[PDB]
Amino acid sequence: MSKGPAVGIDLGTTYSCVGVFQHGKVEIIANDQGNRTTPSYVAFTDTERLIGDAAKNQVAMNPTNTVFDAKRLIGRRFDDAVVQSDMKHWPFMVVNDAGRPKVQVEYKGETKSFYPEEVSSMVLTKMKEIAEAYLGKTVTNAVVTVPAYFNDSQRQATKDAGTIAGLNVLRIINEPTAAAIAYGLDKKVGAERNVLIFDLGGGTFDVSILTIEDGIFEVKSTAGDTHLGGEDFDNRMVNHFIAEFKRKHKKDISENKRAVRRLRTACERAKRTLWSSTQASIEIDSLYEGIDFYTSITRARFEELNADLFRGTLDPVEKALRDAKLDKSQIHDIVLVGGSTRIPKIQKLLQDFFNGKELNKSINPDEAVAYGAAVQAAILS
Amino acid sequence: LGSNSPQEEVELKKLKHLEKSVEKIADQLEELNKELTGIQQGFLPKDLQAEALCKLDRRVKATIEQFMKILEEIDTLILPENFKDSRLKRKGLVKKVQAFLAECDTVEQNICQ
């Protein structure tokens, strides 16, 4: 294969995305399964190591040996409060190696341990292979993104993951900066611009305020919630349906893991339908004790079930504004990042807070960070 | 009655494809059932029977997961009351998958004990 262009990679907590600037535009690259985002999952089995969709697809069969959320551990000390809190919720083991965390798994019949940067290097290797399969050319150069709140150790460990993967990391840039770059915010004529990045996707909620002055990006404040996302919204729907099934049939389906999974999967799909439709229908034959469950939910009901969660996303926006020492009227641009920003109620609450101001949302929210990283990669090549 | 529509032919084709996918997974279950019966009723020394049963674990878990993914795909269908043939086919397929899952659960109860 001949030498290919430089790529942009968004290495996310649950999903990663790779883009390439060519023919005057960014192309977000679909993986081998045709997906434009790839799960940040690595699985270890009796016979092989699986990455991405193949790893996510067998999590139910091999939960203890399927690693994810490496980004929550990268560059952190074992005793970090975040590591200790997060460990309680993971099905895989995290161990202390001289103050540093390591994931511990069974692999090809032997006990093995990996540093978080090794796990992230396997995800980066998959993203590099995804780019090569699409381009038909070798890919070595990349721009990788990190959260604006990442410290020196977290930033360095991410770079180490790139090096291990065999990538030449051109630059490491912040996720809100990448999002601003995608929208060409640095290119708008005039004085300094205050930008708010509202990032609700992949299991985290991050609000960032940036000031752009003569093309220089400065982070003014960061706020958010480390564990908030689509799964929380889906859960409210599941509780609603479980209660509906109890009212209608006087049966509790909650202890039947398969029935709850069928219901949860249908709720996830109904939530996506509600992004563009005002109602969603669900038909599950023989859900529990042979009872068929035929129901529907309106967008209004979905909003009511999640009212406190949606409204609560504005508290971080207020906290970021306070910490950046800016009035809301001083924000020039608002950018939507992450899959949950497709929810019309979330967009409405944010547009109403900013007194009718239009939102930068035309770029798919799941891809905006990779999009900006791909533009940066093209500039550095 | 006797108001068959071209639109229903699209749903019936989706269900037929799902039926074919179920048959492929059911063939894997049939092999597991034959191997389990073969160990339980065969001539392996009682000291080696535990290991032989335990080796079926990965395959039974993979079969269960394949059936669960079929149920999730069937659960995406929306069929109106008038599509009686499609609703009967959907119901019959779900019950067939659920019966197969119960056979998978029996395999799990007989291995790694």
Numbering used by the authors:
A (entry chain A): 1 to 381
B (entry chain B): 148 to 260
Quote what the paper states about this structure:
The 70 kDa heat shock proteins (HSP70s) are an abundant family of ATP-dependent molecular chaperones, involved in many cellular processes including protein folding, prevention of protein aggregation, modulation of protein complexes, and protein transport between cellular compartments. HSP70s bind to extended hydrophobic sequences in newly synthesised and partially folded proteins, in a manner dependent on a cycle of ATP hydrolysis and ADP/ATP exchange. HSP70s consist of a conserved N-terminal nucleotide binding domain (NBD) with ATPase activity, a substrate binding domain (SBD), and a poorly conserved C-terminal domain which terminates with an EEVD tetratricopeptide repeat interaction motif123.
To discriminate between fragments binding in the adenine sub-pocket, other sub-pockets in the ATP-binding site and/or potential secondary binding sites on the HSC70-NBD, we screened wild-type HSC70-NBD in parallel with two HSC70-NBD mutants (S275W and S275F), which block adenine binding to the HSC70 ATP-binding site. The relevance of these mutants was confirmed by their respective HSC70-NBD/BAG1 crystal structures, which showed that both mutations overlapped with the adenine ring of ATP in the ATP-bound HSC70-NBD/BAG1 complex. In addition, we confirmed by SPR that both mutants abolished binding of adenosine, ADP and 1.
